[PDB]
Subunit: 255 residues, 3 copies
């Protein structure tokens, strides 16, 4: 039997919002040490992976590994239901045919209970993360979001280029071209706006804007985004939660 | 305690037949959500991986993850025992020294119970599947089987070559050479004989016929075989079951 | 509740010694079929992975997957405590805030019980092992240790070069250069000093001596070390235990 208590429903809700514009469908693997989930899109160029630890919950009980398949749009529609600060409990049994979502408020006037029908989804969980990436950097989610949103105006392809103490984002299309150049530093006024870079080898990669736009949606979950780039594998964009993380693996373009 | 009920023993039997001409020995990992197993051959150029879900069983109970090591030849010899349409139950305890295979018939005259001695097998399960493969295609198991069987006559090496809307299988040896060229289409007479191709980048790969011959053995498990090819990783041949799959990862030849 | 009995504390102790000069911190994942653990260093060029099976213990009970985070230096300091041949029991509950280490002697005069405070460590377990490595070889731990220790004198970079029936270790620095060349053979006087090589493709790789020095620390756990090399991935150094293994994944240098 699964029983998982979110302090704020907003967390789970916006976590799912994190990867709306979505990879449709997803397998939520719940276990004693918390919840994990991953899903690929139709084109199979973007993998979304999610880990939510126990500490991220107000409360949590499983004692029996349980897999929960469900369509994100249905879940989202169900997740649109409430004050957005309720206590939210996920409930399931030993052989779940359906999952229960339970919203409770400050008092006990409005008790909302929804039941979402589960699904069967075959899925070999992918482990495509690598040991060492050619370059590693991190910056404010908002800044990155802004860069992507701005540059995505000009082209459907954004080129990220990293060299010694230099991070260059470039877009080149029909109407024109644009380039944002940022440089690492330590902001001691408040380190949350700091920009970090660590380069073992320069990189020159190009990504589809469509997807980056989906990546930056996770800005609503963390102050900082961490990007890991290499030419031998999909780029890794990571947003950290209290105890856990939401990460996106994205494949670059060949030519 | 494990208790797993196959409707038809033929399924499990032919599943094991799927990877006879075998990767010798194998670790069957049984858990609440079903069974998984994988094994590599002596040369370590071919990985066989297997997932059997709960729905694929007539019945199934575990409630405690259990690993079952066993030699395929012994198991096969035991699996040769019965009408081939019996109800087949796999039974194990909490600390299994041996596994029980139980065959029962339509009535209750012939009750057959076999006990297979288990084995200790250290094995780091491999996760070599990739997010995106350069090319993806699918076709009738029989057709592919026929192509392999035919071309394997001429050489010990079969070259698969994929370009825009063109799938080319080639063999070149001493006596002569042979090439089968197939093209994608949508068969509306009945889509089971359809041929699908999806190319993000052309490919030119060469495989050992010895192994492909072992791959095509899984034709007895599905109408269609799905092939995923790339130059950066082992090719992936997949046969789908009702709830689960049998897949083969095969390494191409360098030169 | 976890309860794991080592016959000799020396095993566990020296296992941790195996990867001191350490990857700091580590997540010990305990489960019904035994214990696994892995950890990366600060530079993220060296992954240490550990599997300890049930047979390696004098006794073992879990029946509930439990994760145990802990600093290696603290653990080591605690592991310095005892005759070094005590019976050593690891104990934990269902929601461990701390782990118990219990040392008992031949009689029952000195009963030593230590409690180590656990930690929360987010960690996506890496699965970077590959199916086929370009070259595979194995040799006495002592010999390899000696080669590394000797050649590390001259430079901070050791080049391993493998060709047909030829294994060449080279170091080149300021004071001078050095090269050790070994050749495969079958030692029938006693096969433990034998040297094995298996080459599918020649290799020319260079590693940081700093790390190799950390790798060879595991010589105190096995008679033989097994090295698997390829250019497409981190090199794999493996020391085998009774039931389980300690392995190191190391990334070569680009230029």
């Amino acid at each position: 039997m699964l029983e998982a208590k979110f302090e704020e429903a907003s967390l789970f809700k916006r976590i799912i919002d994190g990867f709306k514009d979505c990879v449709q469908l997803v397998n939520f693997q719940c276990k004693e040490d918390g919840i994990i989930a991953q899903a690929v899109d139709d084109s199979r160029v973007l993998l979304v992976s999610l880990e939510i630890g126990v500490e991220a919950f107000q409360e949590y009980a499983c004692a029996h590994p349980v897999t929960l398949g469900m369509d994100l749009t249905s879940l989202s529609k169900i997740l649109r239901c409430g004050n957005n600060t309720d206590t939210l409990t996920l409930i399931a049994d030993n052989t779940p045919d359906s999952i229960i979502l339970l919203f409770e408020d400050t008092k006990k006037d409005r008790i909302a209970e929804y039941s979402l029908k589960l699904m069967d989804i075959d899925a070999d969980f992918l482990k495509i993360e690598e040991l060492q990436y050619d370059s590693t950097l991190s910056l404010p989610s908002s800044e990155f979001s802004k860069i992507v949103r701005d540059l995505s105006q000009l082209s459907d392809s954004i080129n990220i280029m990293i060299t010694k103490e230099t991070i260059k984002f470039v877009a080149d299309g029909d109407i024109g071209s644009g380039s944002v150049i940022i440089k690492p530093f330590v902001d001691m006024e408040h380190p949350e706006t700091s920009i970090k870079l660590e380069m073992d080898q320069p990189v020159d990669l190009t990504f589809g804007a469509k997807y980056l736009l989906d990546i930056i949606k996770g800005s609503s979950l963390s102050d900082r985004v961490g990007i890991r780039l290499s030419s031998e594998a999909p780029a890794l964009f990571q947003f950290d939660l209290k105890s856990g993380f939401l990460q996106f693996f994205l494949a670059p373009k060949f030519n």
